[PDB]
Amino acid sequence: QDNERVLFAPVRMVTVPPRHYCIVANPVSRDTQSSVLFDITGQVRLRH
Amino acid sequence: ADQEIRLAQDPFPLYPQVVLPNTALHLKALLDFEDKNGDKVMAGDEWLFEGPGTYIPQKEVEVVEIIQATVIKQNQALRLRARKEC
Amino acid sequence: ADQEIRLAQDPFPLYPQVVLPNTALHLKALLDFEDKNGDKVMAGDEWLFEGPGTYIPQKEVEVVEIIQATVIKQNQALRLRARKEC
Amino acid sequence: GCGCPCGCGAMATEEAIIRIPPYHYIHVLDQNSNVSRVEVGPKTYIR
Amino acid sequence: GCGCPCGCGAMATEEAIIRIPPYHYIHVLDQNSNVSRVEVGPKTYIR
């Protein structure tokens, strides 16, 4: 759908699809410890 | 900060990063400085360092100033002074 | 005071700040002077200082006056006098 | 009316409908939205 | 514009400004009130 390729992981979710015109890139980490990283558009170092 | 996303397809990658060829910058407090190797600093006075690199000299913040490459040939000798002002 | 908001995207940041290259200013009371390092002063007579920096020479208030860079070469010698007026 | 007139339609108060009259050509535009809804997989993000 | 045009100015939504174009004569009216305040001596009555 508009070019997608999501990835689910234990508690954390990684997204890197250049969807149509609205980027889905926003790797949200959910450190159950006490931290919650949800930078939709932030310091994320992606590669492939 | 930004989000340099590098993707590789064919022998021509795009990024909507490479190493710094013998480049150095002047570390200081200002706004921190990390590294994905092992060591990282969250404070500091005036101290420069060279060597590793993944950082991309961002026109916004490159710690202080940036200086690339190694200049002096063989015969180039250098004399330095003590310093201090006021 | 203002609110210099710096944002970084691509290797070209905008701000609707960098360091002062060997710059100094003449501290005084007037209207205080802080720093995000550790020390900070809320009063004072005439005393200048150099070194660190994040402050942006604001045309409104730069403490008193500002002076950038280090001038004197090697051979440049300087003689100073006592002073005092009236 | 008589002849080729205006390009009206600009609601005021709290509304945001603007008028634009290019060389006698009637035109009007609304602005009652300016919100983007980016569907990021199993999440609906709004702006 | 070209020639003698309209008699516009009718804000919609929750507004109440109406338009009236009698024989090419521009006219507009507001209705954001319709409340009467009858001062009955030491008492201010509203309607």
UniProtKB/Swiss-Prot annotation, chains B, C:
The vault ribonucleoprotein particle is a huge (400 A x 670 A) cage structure of 12.9 MDa. It consists of a dimer of half-vaults, with each half-vault comprising 39 identical major vault protein (MVP) chains, PARP4 and one or more vault RNAs (vRNAs). Interacts with TEP1. Interacts with PTEN and activated MAPK1. The phosphorylated protein interacts with the SH2 domains of PTPN11 and SRC. Interacts with APEX1. May interact with ZNF540. It is found in: Cytoplasm; Nucleus. Required for normal vault structure. Vaults are multi-subunit structures that may act as scaffolds for proteins involved in signal transduction. Vaults may also play a role in nucleo-cytoplasmic transport. Down-regulates IFNG-mediated STAT1 signaling and subsequent activation of JAK. Down-regulates SRC activity and signaling through MAP kinases. Phosphorylated on Tyr residues after EGF stimulation. Disulfide bonds: none annotated. MVP repeats lie at residues 17-68. This is Major vault protein. MVP 3 mediates interaction with PTEN.
